[PDB]
Amino acid sequence: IFKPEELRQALMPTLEALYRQDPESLPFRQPVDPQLLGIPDYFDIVKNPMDLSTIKRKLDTGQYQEPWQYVDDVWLMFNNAWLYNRKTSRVYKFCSKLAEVFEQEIDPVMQS
Ligand SMILES: CCOc1ccc(C(C)=O)cc1NC(=O)c1cccc(C(=O)O)c1
């Protein structure tokens, strides 16, 4: 059993860690807009879009009852980017960096 605000305080530093990464978090800070980004097939491929702003809003409105639900949304965001983008993409490579940062940050948090 987790109290939403307690979980939020525990998890927020990990989300902050992602946001802190500049430029690597920039493609992830707002929801993908396929028309703006010149990726018109995006919503065909990515059925379950996720971004940092969405994760933050879920965290802030207590929609994560349990820490793995948060972790699952972070990895959803990563997996979407790896799925849509080519390995040669700026976004793909940025995503890989974010995943490294996240793993490094979420580990000591889950322990606590
Ligand atoms: C131009 C392609 O832009 C993207 C393509 C795919 C994705 C995902 C998350 O799959 C995201 C983006 N967006 C960006 O790269 C982006 C958007 C806004 C700003 C910046 C930036 O680096 O300043 C970068």
In the chain, domain spans: 1-112
**Ligand 1, CB within 6 Å, residue ranges:** 23, 26-28, 32, 37, 39, 81, 84-85, 91
Fold topology of 1-112:
Histone Acetyltransferase; Chain A (1.20.920)
Long-range contacts of 95-99 (CB under 8 A, 24+ apart): 95/27, 95/28, 97/21, 97/24, 98/18, 98/21, 98/24, 98/25, 98/28
* Integer Cα distance of 88 and 42 in angstroms: 17
For the packed helices 67-84 and 52-60, what is the interaxial angle rounded to 10 degrees?
Answer: 170
* Integer Cα distance of 71 and 38 in angstroms: 29
Q: What is the resolution of this structure in A?
A: 1.7
Residue nearest (by alpha carbon) to ligand 1 atom 15: 27
Residue nearest (by alpha carbon) to ligand 1 atom 11: 27
Residue nearest (by alpha carbon) to ligand 1 atom 23: 26
Centroid of ligand 1 to alpha carbon of 89 (angstroms):
10
Residue 47 corresponds to which amino acid? K
DSSP label at residue 65: S
23 Cα nearest atom in ligand 1: 22
Report H helices in 1-112: 4-20, 34-37, 42-45, 52-60, 67-84, 90-111
